[PDB]
Amino acid sequence: VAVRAKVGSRGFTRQRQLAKGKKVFKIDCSIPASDGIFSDDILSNFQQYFQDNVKLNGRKGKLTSKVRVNMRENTLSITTTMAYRKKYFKYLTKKFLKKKDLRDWIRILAKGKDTYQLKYFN
Residues near RNA, by CB under 7 A: 1-2, 4, 6-8, 13, 15, 55-58, 83-88, 90-91, 94-95, 97-99, 103, 107, 109-110, 113, 119-122
User: In the complex, what is the shortest distance from the CB of residue 111 to RNA, in angstroms, rounded to a whole number?
Assistant: 9
Cα–Cα dist 81/106, whole Å: 30
| 34 versus 57: smaller Cβ distance to RNA | 57
User: In the complex, what is the shortest distance from the CB of residue 73 to RNA, in angstroms, rounded to a whole number?
Assistant: 21
Q: What is the DSSP string of 8-61?
A: GGTT-----B-SS--EEEEEE-HHHHHSSSS-HHHHHHHHHHHHHH-EETTEES
Cα–Cα dist 83/103, whole Å: 28
User: In the complex, what is the shortest distance from the CB of residue 3 to RNA, in angstroms, rounded to a whole number?
Assistant: 7
User: In the complex, what is the shortest distance from the CB of residue 4 to RNA, in angstroms, rounded to a whole number?
Assistant: 6
- The DSSP output letter for 119 is E
| 74 versus 116: smaller Cβ distance to RNA | 116
| 68 versus 95: smaller Cβ distance to RNA | 95
